[PDB]
mmCIF file of C-alpha atoms and ligand atoms in Angstrom:
data_model
loop_
_atom_site.group_PDB
_atom_site.id
_atom_site.type_symbol
_atom_site.label_atom_id
_atom_site.label_comp_id
_atom_site.label_asym_id
_atom_site.label_seq_id
_atom_site.Cartn_x
_atom_site.Cartn_y
_atom_site.Cartn_z
ATOM 1 C CA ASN A 1159 -91.165 -13.488 -0.239
ATOM 2 C CA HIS A 1160 -89.881 -11.466 2.862
ATOM 3 C CA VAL A 1161 -85.943 -11.902 3.631
ATOM 4 C CA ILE A 1162 -85.118 -12.631 7.708
ATOM 5 C CA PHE A 1163 -81.272 -11.746 8.841
ATOM 6 C CA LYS A 1164 -79.646 -14.451 10.990
ATOM 7 C CA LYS A 1165 -76.544 -14.632 13.100
ATOM 8 C CA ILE A 1166 -75.646 -17.707 15.384
ATOM 9 C CA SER A 1167 -73.442 -17.407 17.716
ATOM 10 C CA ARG A 1168 -69.840 -19.566 17.593
ATOM 11 C CA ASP A 1169 -71.106 -21.791 20.595
ATOM 12 C CA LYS A 1170 -74.596 -22.089 19.088
ATOM 13 C CA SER A 1171 -76.764 -20.947 21.880
ATOM 14 C CA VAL A 1172 -77.506 -17.633 20.584
ATOM 15 C CA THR A 1173 -79.437 -16.692 17.180
ATOM 16 C CA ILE A 1174 -80.291 -13.357 16.066
ATOM 17 C CA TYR A 1175 -83.088 -12.536 13.665
ATOM 18 C CA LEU A 1176 -83.347 -9.220 12.117
ATOM 19 C CA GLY A 1177 -85.933 -8.283 9.305
ATOM 20 C CA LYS A 1178 -83.551 -5.304 8.216
ATOM 21 C CA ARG A 1179 -79.403 -4.490 8.256
ATOM 22 C CA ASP A 1180 -80.886 -0.930 7.349
ATOM 23 C CA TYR A 1181 -83.060 1.091 9.490
ATOM 24 C CA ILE A 1182 -84.752 4.094 8.352
ATOM 25 C CA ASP A 1183 -85.011 7.504 9.646
ATOM 26 C CA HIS A 1184 -87.261 10.381 7.810
ATOM 27 C CA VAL A 1185 -86.716 12.272 10.805
ATOM 28 C CA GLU A 1186 -90.240 12.406 11.949
ATOM 29 C CA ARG A 1187 -89.572 9.535 13.668
ATOM 30 C CA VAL A 1188 -86.987 6.278 13.171
ATOM 31 C CA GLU A 1189 -88.143 2.112 12.781
ATOM 32 C CA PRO A 1190 -87.130 0.682 15.681
ATOM 33 C CA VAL A 1191 -85.113 -2.348 15.880
ATOM 34 C CA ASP A 1192 -86.853 -5.032 16.500
ATOM 35 C CA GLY A 1193 -86.129 -8.903 16.143
ATOM 36 C CA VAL A 1194 -86.226 -12.283 18.095
ATOM 37 C CA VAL A 1195 -83.456 -14.024 20.087
ATOM 38 C CA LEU A 1196 -83.412 -18.055 19.232
ATOM 39 C CA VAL A 1197 -81.643 -20.204 22.171
ATOM 40 C CA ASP A 1198 -80.944 -23.727 22.656
ATOM 41 C CA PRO A 1199 -82.780 -24.163 26.274
ATOM 42 C CA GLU A 1200 -79.603 -26.437 27.322
ATOM 43 C CA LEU A 1201 -77.168 -24.090 26.962
ATOM 44 C CA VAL A 1202 -78.687 -21.272 28.276
ATOM 45 C CA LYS A 1203 -79.683 -22.521 31.472
ATOM 46 C CA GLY A 1204 -78.701 -20.643 34.180
ATOM 47 C CA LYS A 1205 -78.301 -17.728 32.409
ATOM 48 C CA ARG A 1206 -79.459 -14.566 31.306
ATOM 49 C CA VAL A 1207 -79.790 -13.082 27.536
ATOM 50 C CA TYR A 1208 -79.672 -9.499 26.330
ATOM 51 C CA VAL A 1209 -79.910 -7.669 23.401
ATOM 52 C CA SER A 1210 -77.932 -3.606 23.076
ATOM 53 C CA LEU A 1211 -78.249 -1.155 20.842
ATOM 54 C CA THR A 1212 -74.954 0.887 21.031
ATOM 55 C CA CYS A 1213 -74.372 4.228 18.879
ATOM 56 C CA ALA A 1214 -70.362 5.185 19.014
ATOM 57 C CA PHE A 1215 -67.880 7.555 17.131
ATOM 58 C CA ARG A 1216 -64.835 6.196 16.794
ATOM 59 C CA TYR A 1217 -61.682 8.603 15.721
ATOM 60 C CA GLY A 1218 -58.471 6.522 14.206
ATOM 61 C CA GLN A 1219 -59.482 2.829 13.019
ATOM 62 C CA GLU A 1220 -61.915 1.088 11.053
ATOM 63 C CA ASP A 1221 -64.052 -0.756 13.961
ATOM 64 C CA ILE A 1222 -63.925 -0.131 17.788
ATOM 65 C CA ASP A 1223 -61.209 -1.311 18.030
ATOM 66 C CA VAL A 1224 -57.840 -2.991 17.978
ATOM 67 C CA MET A 1225 -55.416 -2.447 20.886
ATOM 68 C CA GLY A 1226 -57.939 0.471 22.369
ATOM 69 C CA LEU A 1227 -55.952 2.512 19.406
ATOM 70 C CA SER A 1228 -59.123 4.560 18.639
ATOM 71 C CA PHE A 1229 -60.608 7.444 20.236
ATOM 72 C CA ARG A 1230 -63.996 6.826 21.129
ATOM 73 C CA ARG A 1231 -67.402 8.195 22.187
ATOM 74 C CA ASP A 1232 -70.501 6.634 22.945
ATOM 75 C CA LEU A 1233 -73.498 8.584 21.063
ATOM 76 C CA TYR A 1234 -76.424 6.497 22.404
ATOM 77 C CA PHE A 1235 -76.678 3.267 24.769
ATOM 78 C CA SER A 1236 -79.713 0.695 25.585
ATOM 79 C CA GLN A 1237 -80.305 -2.894 26.620
ATOM 80 C CA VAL A 1238 -82.752 -4.718 26.956
ATOM 81 C CA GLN A 1239 -83.536 -8.593 28.482
ATOM 82 C CA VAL A 1240 -84.839 -10.973 25.980
ATOM 83 C CA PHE A 1241 -83.872 -14.452 28.128
ATOM 84 C CA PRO A 1242 -85.729 -15.574 30.383
ATOM 85 C CA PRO A 1243 -89.257 -14.119 29.305
ATOM 86 C CA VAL A 1244 -89.868 -10.685 31.198
ATOM 87 C CA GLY A 1245 -93.097 -9.838 32.153
ATOM 88 C CA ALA A 1246 -95.843 -10.548 29.506
ATOM 89 C CA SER A 1247 -95.782 -13.125 26.841
ATOM 90 C CA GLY A 1248 -95.797 -12.760 22.899
ATOM 91 C CA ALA A 1249 -94.804 -10.065 20.503
ATOM 92 C CA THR A 1250 -95.828 -6.516 20.499
ATOM 93 C CA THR A 1251 -94.934 -6.605 16.664
ATOM 94 C CA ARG A 1252 -96.185 -9.092 13.378
ATOM 95 C CA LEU A 1253 -92.941 -9.567 12.576
ATOM 96 C CA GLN A 1254 -91.648 -11.002 16.025
ATOM 97 C CA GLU A 1255 -95.300 -12.591 16.199
ATOM 98 C CA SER A 1256 -94.966 -14.828 12.889
ATOM 99 C CA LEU A 1257 -90.830 -15.184 12.876
ATOM 100 C CA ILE A 1258 -92.067 -16.922 16.697
ATOM 101 C CA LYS A 1259 -94.420 -18.616 14.827
ATOM 102 C CA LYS A 1260 -92.216 -20.339 12.054
ATOM 103 C CA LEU A 1261 -88.859 -20.657 14.796
ATOM 104 C CA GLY A 1262 -90.700 -22.000 17.681
ATOM 105 C CA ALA A 1263 -90.764 -22.274 21.570
ATOM 106 C CA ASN A 1264 -87.360 -21.022 22.175
ATOM 107 C CA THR A 1265 -87.580 -17.893 19.927
ATOM 108 C CA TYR A 1266 -88.553 -14.775 22.019
ATOM 109 C CA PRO A 1267 -88.688 -11.097 21.024
ATOM 110 C CA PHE A 1268 -86.980 -8.339 21.318
ATOM 111 C CA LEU A 1269 -87.372 -4.390 20.309
ATOM 112 C CA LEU A 1270 -84.813 -1.391 20.724
ATOM 113 C CA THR A 1271 -85.871 2.007 20.137
ATOM 114 C CA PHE A 1272 -83.576 4.772 18.657
ATOM 115 C CA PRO A 1273 -84.036 8.814 19.695
ATOM 116 C CA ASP A 1274 -84.543 11.390 17.603
ATOM 117 C CA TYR A 1275 -81.000 12.660 18.327
ATOM 118 C CA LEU A 1276 -78.170 10.348 16.740
ATOM 119 C CA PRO A 1277 -76.678 11.111 13.176
ATOM 120 C CA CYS A 1278 -77.001 8.010 10.580
ATOM 121 C CA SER A 1279 -74.535 6.034 9.136
ATOM 122 C CA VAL A 1280 -71.393 8.082 8.329
ATOM 123 C CA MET A 1281 -67.849 6.888 8.193
ATOM 124 C CA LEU A 1282 -64.429 7.844 6.153
ATOM 125 C CA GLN A 1283 -61.218 6.409 5.200
ATOM 126 C CA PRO A 1284 -58.754 9.108 3.882
ATOM 127 C CA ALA A 1285 -56.979 8.985 1.049
ATOM 128 C CA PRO A 1286 -53.119 8.892 0.245
ATOM 129 C CA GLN A 1287 -53.549 12.579 -0.279
ATOM 130 C CA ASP A 1288 -55.477 13.250 3.108
ATOM 131 C CA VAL A 1289 -54.446 13.703 6.729
ATOM 132 C CA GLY A 1290 -56.473 12.311 9.457
ATOM 133 C CA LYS A 1291 -57.524 8.871 10.022
ATOM 134 C CA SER A 1292 -60.595 6.672 9.473
ATOM 135 C CA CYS A 1293 -63.474 7.365 11.634
ATOM 136 C CA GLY A 1294 -67.272 6.658 11.719
ATOM 137 C CA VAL A 1295 -70.625 6.074 13.517
ATOM 138 C CA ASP A 1296 -71.131 2.715 14.012
ATOM 139 C CA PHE A 1297 -74.579 1.286 15.541
ATOM 140 C CA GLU A 1298 -74.448 -1.914 17.302
ATOM 141 C CA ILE A 1299 -76.774 -4.360 17.636
ATOM 142 C CA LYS A 1300 -75.560 -6.751 19.854
ATOM 143 C CA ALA A 1301 -76.903 -10.414 21.636
ATOM 144 C CA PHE A 1302 -75.275 -11.607 24.122
ATOM 145 C CA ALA A 1303 -75.636 -14.151 27.367
ATOM 146 C CA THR A 1304 -74.502 -13.741 30.694
ATOM 147 C CA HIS A 1305 -73.968 -16.100 34.030
ATOM 148 C CA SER A 1306 -72.626 -15.990 37.517
ATOM 149 C CA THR A 1307 -69.819 -18.013 38.862
ATOM 150 C CA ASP A 1308 -69.152 -19.122 42.579
ATOM 151 C CA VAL A 1309 -66.728 -15.914 43.084
ATOM 152 C CA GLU A 1310 -69.618 -13.937 42.221
ATOM 153 C CA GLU A 1311 -67.802 -12.572 39.173
ATOM 154 C CA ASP A 1312 -70.435 -12.369 36.291
ATOM 155 C CA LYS A 1313 -69.136 -13.226 32.917
ATOM 156 C CA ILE A 1314 -69.609 -12.384 29.493
ATOM 157 C CA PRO A 1315 -68.334 -15.111 26.461
ATOM 158 C CA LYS A 1316 -67.314 -13.617 23.111
ATOM 159 C CA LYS A 1317 -68.571 -16.982 22.041
ATOM 160 C CA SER A 1318 -72.030 -16.492 23.598
ATOM 161 C CA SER A 1319 -72.949 -13.083 21.738
ATOM 162 C CA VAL A 1320 -73.380 -12.002 17.967
ATOM 163 C CA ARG A 1321 -72.242 -8.619 16.845
ATOM 164 C CA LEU A 1322 -74.539 -7.014 14.061
ATOM 165 C CA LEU A 1323 -73.618 -3.875 12.694
ATOM 166 C CA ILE A 1324 -76.404 -1.958 11.409
ATOM 167 C CA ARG A 1325 -76.662 1.094 9.249
ATOM 168 C CA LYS A 1326 -79.275 4.121 10.788
ATOM 169 C CA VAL A 1327 -80.418 5.212 7.051
ATOM 170 C CA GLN A 1328 -81.354 8.923 5.952
ATOM 171 C CA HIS A 1329 -84.872 9.455 4.110
ATOM 172 C CA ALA A 1330 -86.879 12.456 3.207
ATOM 173 C CA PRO A 1331 -89.261 14.593 5.327
ATOM 174 C CA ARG A 1332 -92.746 14.943 4.688
ATOM 175 C CA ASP A 1333 -91.048 19.267 3.696
ATOM 176 C CA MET A 1334 -87.911 20.648 1.429
ATOM 177 C CA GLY A 1335 -86.908 24.205 1.683
ATOM 178 C CA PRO A 1336 -86.877 26.616 -0.772
ATOM 179 C CA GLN A 1337 -85.739 26.830 -4.651
ATOM 180 C CA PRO A 1338 -81.667 26.789 -4.148
ATOM 181 C CA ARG A 1339 -80.702 29.233 -6.345
ATOM 182 C CA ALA A 1340 -77.581 31.925 -6.258
ATOM 183 C CA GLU A 1341 -75.950 35.073 -8.406
ATOM 184 C CA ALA A 1342 -73.054 36.077 -8.388
ATOM 185 C CA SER A 1343 -70.952 38.911 -10.297
ATOM 186 C CA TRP A 1344 -67.233 39.403 -11.292
ATOM 187 C CA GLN A 1345 -65.884 42.626 -12.222
ATOM 188 C CA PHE A 1346 -62.493 41.844 -13.426
ATOM 189 C CA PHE A 1347 -59.206 44.655 -12.938
ATOM 190 C CA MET A 1348 -59.229 47.048 -15.502
ATOM 191 C CA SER A 1349 -62.592 46.228 -17.042
ATOM 192 C CA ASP A 1350 -65.855 48.191 -16.600
ATOM 193 C CA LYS A 1351 -68.072 45.384 -17.421
ATOM 194 C CA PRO A 1352 -69.572 42.434 -15.185
ATOM 195 C CA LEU A 1353 -69.697 38.575 -15.899
ATOM 196 C CA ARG A 1354 -72.631 37.546 -14.179
ATOM 197 C CA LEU A 1355 -73.351 33.856 -12.948
ATOM 198 C CA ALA A 1356 -77.220 32.659 -12.342
ATOM 199 C CA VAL A 1357 -77.261 28.853 -11.207
ATOM 200 C CA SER A 1358 -80.689 27.209 -10.050
ATOM 201 C CA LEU A 1359 -81.625 23.542 -8.768
ATOM 202 C CA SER A 1360 -85.241 22.561 -9.452
ATOM 203 C CA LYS A 1361 -85.296 21.401 -6.290
ATOM 204 C CA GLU A 1362 -83.665 21.440 -2.442
ATOM 205 C CA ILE A 1363 -83.569 17.887 -1.371
ATOM 206 C CA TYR A 1364 -82.772 15.322 -4.054
ATOM 207 C CA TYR A 1365 -82.808 11.321 -3.803
ATOM 208 C CA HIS A 1366 -79.466 8.926 -4.027
ATOM 209 C CA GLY A 1367 -79.552 7.853 -7.688
ATOM 210 C CA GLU A 1368 -82.134 11.017 -8.766
ATOM 211 C CA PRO A 1369 -80.832 13.314 -11.570
ATOM 212 C CA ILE A 1370 -79.963 16.765 -10.732
ATOM 213 C CA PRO A 1371 -80.786 19.118 -13.421
ATOM 214 C CA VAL A 1372 -78.513 22.206 -12.852
ATOM 215 C CA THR A 1373 -79.226 25.460 -14.579
ATOM 216 C CA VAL A 1374 -77.116 27.935 -15.708
ATOM 217 C CA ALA A 1375 -77.251 31.468 -16.557
ATOM 218 C CA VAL A 1376 -74.033 33.108 -18.053
ATOM 219 C CA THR A 1377 -74.557 37.059 -18.585
ATOM 220 C CA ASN A 1378 -71.065 37.804 -19.933
ATOM 221 C CA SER A 1379 -70.879 41.458 -20.566
ATOM 222 C CA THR A 1380 -66.885 41.499 -21.050
ATOM 223 C CA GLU A 1381 -64.318 41.312 -23.423
ATOM 224 C CA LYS A 1382 -63.189 37.928 -22.527
ATOM 225 C CA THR A 1383 -64.470 34.604 -23.362
ATOM 226 C CA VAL A 1384 -65.560 31.633 -20.786
ATOM 227 C CA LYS A 1385 -63.533 29.005 -22.219
ATOM 228 C CA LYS A 1386 -64.768 26.573 -19.497
ATOM 229 C CA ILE A 1387 -68.329 26.015 -17.847
ATOM 230 C CA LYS A 1388 -67.292 23.237 -15.044
ATOM 231 C CA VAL A 1389 -70.147 21.899 -12.382
ATOM 232 C CA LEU A 1390 -69.317 19.703 -9.554
ATOM 233 C CA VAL A 1391 -71.442 17.867 -6.884
ATOM 234 C CA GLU A 1392 -68.876 18.149 -3.952
ATOM 235 C CA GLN A 1393 -69.505 16.609 -1.031
ATOM 236 C CA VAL A 1394 -68.132 18.459 2.572
ATOM 237 C CA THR A 1395 -67.655 16.824 5.567
ATOM 238 C CA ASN A 1396 -66.771 17.872 8.854
ATOM 239 C CA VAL A 1397 -65.592 15.909 11.652
ATOM 240 C CA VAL A 1398 -66.771 17.387 14.881
ATOM 241 C CA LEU A 1399 -65.325 15.239 17.066
ATOM 242 C CA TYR A 1400 -61.878 14.831 18.554
ATOM 243 C CA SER A 1401 -59.597 15.748 15.728
ATOM 244 C CA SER A 1402 -61.150 18.760 13.403
ATOM 245 C CA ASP A 1403 -60.562 17.420 9.752
ATOM 246 C CA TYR A 1404 -62.182 18.851 7.093
ATOM 247 C CA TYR A 1405 -62.983 16.889 3.449
ATOM 248 C CA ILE A 1406 -64.069 18.724 0.328
ATOM 249 C CA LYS A 1407 -64.003 16.532 -2.362
ATOM 250 C CA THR A 1408 -66.613 15.954 -5.797
ATOM 251 C CA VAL A 1409 -68.373 13.357 -6.727
ATOM 252 C CA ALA A 1410 -70.185 14.293 -9.986
ATOM 253 C CA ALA A 1411 -68.622 16.181 -12.721
ATOM 254 C CA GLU A 1412 -69.725 17.539 -15.861
ATOM 255 C CA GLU A 1413 -68.117 20.009 -18.547
ATOM 256 C CA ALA A 1414 -70.381 21.844 -21.027
ATOM 257 C CA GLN A 1415 -68.958 21.864 -24.827
ATOM 258 C CA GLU A 1416 -70.016 25.593 -24.707
ATOM 259 C CA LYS A 1417 -68.169 29.069 -24.578
ATOM 260 C CA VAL A 1418 -69.683 32.059 -24.138
ATOM 261 C CA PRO A 1419 -68.212 35.019 -26.487
ATOM 262 C CA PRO A 1420 -67.454 38.112 -25.019
ATOM 263 C CA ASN A 1421 -70.526 40.400 -25.003
ATOM 264 C CA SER A 1422 -73.144 37.453 -24.855
ATOM 265 C CA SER A 1423 -75.630 35.116 -22.682
ATOM 266 C CA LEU A 1424 -75.977 31.300 -22.774
ATOM 267 C CA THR A 1425 -78.414 29.246 -20.701
ATOM 268 C CA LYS A 1426 -78.065 25.552 -20.252
ATOM 269 C CA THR A 1427 -79.049 22.837 -18.441
ATOM 270 C CA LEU A 1428 -76.518 20.052 -17.194
ATOM 271 C CA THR A 1429 -77.585 16.887 -15.499
ATOM 272 C CA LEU A 1430 -75.334 15.298 -12.233
ATOM 273 C CA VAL A 1431 -75.874 11.643 -10.585
ATOM 274 C CA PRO A 1432 -73.529 11.732 -7.675
ATOM 275 C CA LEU A 1433 -73.132 8.493 -7.158
ATOM 276 C CA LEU A 1434 -70.708 6.398 -5.055
ATOM 277 C CA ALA A 1435 -70.181 4.286 -8.248
ATOM 278 C CA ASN A 1436 -69.144 7.156 -10.161
ATOM 279 C CA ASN A 1437 -66.084 7.297 -8.074
ATOM 280 C CA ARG A 1438 -63.092 5.161 -9.247
ATOM 281 C CA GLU A 1439 -61.317 6.427 -5.111
ATOM 282 C CA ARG A 1440 -64.018 5.520 -2.577
ATOM 283 C CA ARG A 1441 -61.465 6.879 -0.027
ATOM 284 C CA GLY A 1442 -61.591 10.376 1.294
ATOM 285 C CA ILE A 1443 -65.597 10.460 0.891
ATOM 286 C CA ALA A 1444 -68.117 10.212 3.470
ATOM 287 C CA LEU A 1445 -69.884 6.540 2.777
ATOM 288 C CA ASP A 1446 -72.975 4.944 4.909
ATOM 289 C CA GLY A 1447 -70.607 1.831 5.221
ATOM 290 C CA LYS A 1448 -67.574 -0.093 4.710
ATOM 291 C CA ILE A 1449 -65.700 0.373 1.329
ATOM 292 C CA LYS A 1450 -65.364 -3.200 1.097
ATOM 293 C CA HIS A 1451 -69.471 -3.640 0.414
ATOM 294 C CA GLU A 1452 -71.138 -3.530 -2.199
ATOM 295 C CA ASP A 1453 -74.637 -1.922 -0.822
ATOM 296 C CA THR A 1454 -72.392 1.101 0.450
ATOM 297 C CA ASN A 1455 -73.416 4.784 -0.551
ATOM 298 C CA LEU A 1456 -72.819 8.274 -0.072
ATOM 299 C CA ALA A 1457 -73.439 9.460 3.313
ATOM 300 C CA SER A 1458 -76.876 11.525 3.371
ATOM 301 C CA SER A 1459 -76.942 14.749 4.128
ATOM 302 C CA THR A 1460 -76.553 15.767 7.657
ATOM 303 C CA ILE A 1461 -79.685 16.567 9.549
ATOM 304 C CA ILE A 1462 -79.811 17.801 12.702
ATOM 305 C CA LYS A 1463 -83.036 18.492 15.267
ATOM 306 C CA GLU A 1464 -83.269 22.069 17.177
ATOM 307 C CA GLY A 1465 -80.873 22.307 19.946
ATOM 308 C CA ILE A 1466 -79.036 19.678 19.217
ATOM 309 C CA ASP A 1467 -74.969 20.394 19.758
ATOM 310 C CA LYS A 1468 -74.032 19.424 15.891
ATOM 311 C CA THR A 1469 -70.617 18.305 17.839
ATOM 312 C CA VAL A 1470 -72.502 15.187 18.893
ATOM 313 C CA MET A 1471 -73.264 13.976 15.326
ATOM 314 C CA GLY A 1472 -70.004 13.478 14.878
ATOM 315 C CA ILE A 1473 -69.417 13.859 11.632
ATOM 316 C CA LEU A 1474 -70.811 16.244 9.184
ATOM 317 C CA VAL A 1475 -72.116 16.216 5.912
ATOM 318 C CA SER A 1476 -73.172 18.598 3.508
ATOM 319 C CA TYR A 1477 -73.552 18.707 -0.265
ATOM 320 C CA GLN A 1478 -72.729 21.200 -3.042
ATOM 321 C CA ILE A 1479 -73.513 22.243 -6.719
ATOM 322 C CA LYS A 1480 -70.336 24.329 -7.646
ATOM 323 C CA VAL A 1481 -69.847 25.801 -10.848
ATOM 324 C CA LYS A 1482 -66.547 27.444 -11.860
ATOM 325 C CA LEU A 1483 -65.914 29.259 -14.861
ATOM 326 C CA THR A 1484 -62.653 29.094 -17.328
ATOM 327 C CA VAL A 1485 -62.315 33.024 -18.481
ATOM 328 C CA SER A 1486 -59.411 33.124 -21.097
ATOM 329 C CA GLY A 1487 -56.564 36.134 -20.770
ATOM 330 C CA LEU A 1488 -57.288 36.208 -16.521
ATOM 331 C CA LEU A 1489 -55.253 33.188 -15.332
ATOM 332 C CA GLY A 1490 -51.729 33.824 -14.247
ATOM 333 C CA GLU A 1491 -52.340 37.512 -15.760
ATOM 334 C CA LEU A 1492 -55.736 39.068 -13.930
ATOM 335 C CA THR A 1493 -55.947 36.802 -11.022
ATOM 336 C CA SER A 1494 -54.599 34.396 -9.371
ATOM 337 C CA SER A 1495 -57.933 33.347 -7.759
ATOM 338 C CA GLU A 1496 -60.655 30.952 -9.033
ATOM 339 C CA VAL A 1497 -64.048 32.198 -10.486
ATOM 340 C CA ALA A 1498 -67.132 30.102 -9.367
ATOM 341 C CA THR A 1499 -70.074 30.377 -7.237
ATOM 342 C CA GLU A 1500 -71.548 27.239 -4.892
ATOM 343 C CA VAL A 1501 -75.501 26.490 -4.446
ATOM 344 C CA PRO A 1502 -76.059 23.950 -1.757
ATOM 345 C CA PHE A 1503 -78.852 21.142 -1.466
ATOM 346 C CA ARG A 1504 -79.638 17.963 0.347
ATOM 347 C CA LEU A 1505 -79.111 14.220 -0.758
ATOM 348 C CA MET A 1506 -80.437 11.572 0.806
ATOM 349 C CA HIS A 1507 -83.083 8.236 0.121
ATOM 350 C CA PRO A 1508 -87.015 8.541 -0.991
ATOM 351 C CA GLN A 1509 -89.699 9.577 1.521
ATOM 352 C CA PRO A 1510 -91.236 6.596 2.776
ATOM 353 C CA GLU A 1511 -94.420 6.021 2.582
ATOM 354 C CA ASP A 1512 -97.481 5.071 4.345
ATOM 355 C CA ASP A 1513 -99.550 -14.299 7.404
ATOM 356 C CA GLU A 1514 -96.343 -14.065 4.833
ATOM 357 C CA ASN A 1515 -93.328 -16.747 3.917
ATOM 358 C CA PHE A 1516 -89.834 -15.990 5.254
ATOM 359 C CA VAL A 1517 -86.129 -16.616 3.842
ATOM 360 C CA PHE A 1518 -83.367 -16.425 6.124
ATOM 361 C CA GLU A 1519 -79.994 -14.802 4.727
ATOM 362 C CA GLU A 1520 -76.866 -14.639 7.026
ATOM 363 C CA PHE A 1521 -76.537 -10.876 7.841
ATOM 364 C CA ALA A 1522 -73.053 -10.441 6.541
ATOM 365 C CA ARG A 1523 -72.688 -8.152 4.140
ATOM 366 C CA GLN A 1524 -71.869 -8.763 0.323
ATOM 367 C CA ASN A 1525 -68.352 -7.547 -0.568
ATOM 368 C CA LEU A 1526 -67.718 -5.518 -3.572
ATOM 369 C CA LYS A 1527 -68.055 -7.380 -6.654
HETATM 370 NA NA1 NA B 628 -63.336 43.194 -20.010
#
């Protein structure tokens, strides 16, 4: 079985079919959006039909745009002619050949590539506590019909078009970086002896839903007790277009049950799983889609190609493990400050790997249960 997604214009003249809602970037390359457009021959007579792919950044709205009330900067734009048929006939892909075999003679292929310099789907709606507005990067697939008027004004009527917001989803590349690790030491006021914290991760990339084994070694040479060992996954978000908004938020947390007495060491591995489901509040963190939708995830770590300016990504997402130690008799007495350290890591979807029967679903995404 193969689920095909479809949407049809208010006026019934144009119907678009897609194989996926979600298009894979493994960063070596990215999936093209290939699909077909079914037309009503009678409603498209004398008309042209195109499909465009637009990547845009928007600040100030959850979409572009109501009352032109938002800032917008386009990252990429492409458009192909789907009807009348251009040049040679037939599909360039099996999906297309198959969908055309099934749907019949009013169906026409279209294929839209992605380039390698774009970000992946990212959006944020701010929490009450935050300032700065909603923003994100949208990927629009639009199929529309144009016609001519005797006044020589061409027309692109809304009722003849269909707009699908797809996702460009980040999947892991062939290779990952070295084992993440960090070593911090503190010498407190009046003290001759160090508190050391080493922290290590099993690998530099993790998959959404994959448990992250944070291993911690405390060497406490001090007279103090470490009352608490806390471990966080922090999501760090930078808005690099328009407003400068900066967000850092805890998407996962774990507390050890153990303390570290003066003059002792402790080594323990805590396991964290940074999912959006763990978060009651979905606001003020970078997601790959709208809050309302069941399929939405945490944004994957941004990946910038060499030689691309980061502002052109429009929102930067990155992750770190933060380990905070709580030290007895310090705070308000020997420090106004945290004792903590961070180890960065990347978070994305799994590495991808290396006729049929179709079932048609409406493209609109399922709302949150
Ligand atoms: Na001490």
